[PDB]
Amino acid sequence: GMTEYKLVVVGAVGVGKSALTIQLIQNHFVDEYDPTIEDCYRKQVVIDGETCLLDILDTAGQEEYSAMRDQYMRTGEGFLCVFAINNTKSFEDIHHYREQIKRVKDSEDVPMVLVGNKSDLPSRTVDTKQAQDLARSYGIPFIETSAKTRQGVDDAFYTLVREIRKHKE
Numbered sequence: 001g002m003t004e005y006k007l008v009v010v011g012a013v014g015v016g017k018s019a020l021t022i023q024l025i026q027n028h029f030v031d032e033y034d035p036t037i038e039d040c041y042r043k044q045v046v047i048d049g050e051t052c053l054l055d056i057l058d059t060a061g062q063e064e065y066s067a068m069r070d071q072y073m074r075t076g077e078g079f080l081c082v083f084a085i086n087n088t089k090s091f092e093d094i095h096h097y098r099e100q101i102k103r104v105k106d107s108e109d110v111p112m113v114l115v116g117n118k119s120d121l122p123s124r125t126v127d128t129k130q131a132q133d134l135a136r137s138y139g140i141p142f143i144e145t146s147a148k149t150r151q152g153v154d155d156a157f158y159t160l161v162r163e164i165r166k167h168k169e
């Protein structure tokens, strides 16, 4: 039948996880989404000629490591690790997110995509070369996005699906 891919969007509070997810699903930019609210979304799409269902969790709390929460995150098949290009700390947080994901999945090979969001901004503090190099060190794609303009949004999620497909093959 039609495969369902469980995707989890993670990253520091304020990087644009909710805005990215809502942009993917609803095709508009929500700029004041409650930072504490977690929700999930589904969307049927065709990727490389194969129809599939995306089941996406937009995470709120990024630091609750209960046994329940770990097992919940464990259901995730692919992770979008998002930072904001104007917050260096959010970029330096990525290392911890990847370590946590590897721990939770009990695997050194977890489908992941690094996402540098807010690319529409006229200023940035995270050099694109830094992010490219980090992504290469992890062996994962790097995608620049703007939830505001839609730039890279479909690309980020669909690239993650493609990463899951390769892993499962």
Ligand SMILES: Nc1nc2c(ncn2[C@@H]2O[C@H](COP(=O)(O)OP(=O)(O)O)[C@@H](O)[C@H]2O)c(=O)[nH]1
Pocket: 011, 012, 013, 014, 015, 016, 017, 018, 019, 020, 030, 031, 032, 033, 034, 035, 117, 118, 119, 120, 121, 145, 146, 147, 148, 149
């Ligand atoms: N300029 C710009 N602002 C964004 C973008 N994505 C999110 N924001 C803003 O960043 C803030 C936090 O976004 P939010 O989606 O709530 O981030 P979250 O905490 O990771 O879910 C909000 O004020 C958004 O309006 C983007 O691509 N470009």
Ligand SMILES: N#Cc1c(N)sc2c1CCCC2
Pocket: 010, 059, 061, 062, 063, 064, 065, 066, 069, 070, 073, 097, 100, 101, 104
């Ligand atoms: N809160 C919380 C989280 C866990 N208990 S595991 C894990 C996250 C967020 C990032 C991914 C991996």
Ligand SMILES: SCc1nc2ccccc2[nH]1
Pocket: 006, 007, 008, 039, 040, 055, 056, 057, 072, 073, 075, 076, 077
């Ligand atoms: S809330 C439904 C739902 N839970 C998930 C947990 C991980 C990835 C996708 C998910 N969708």
Ligand SMILES: [Mg+2]
Pocket: 017, 018, 019, 033, 034, 035, 036, 037, 058, 059, 060
């Ligand atoms: Mg949010």
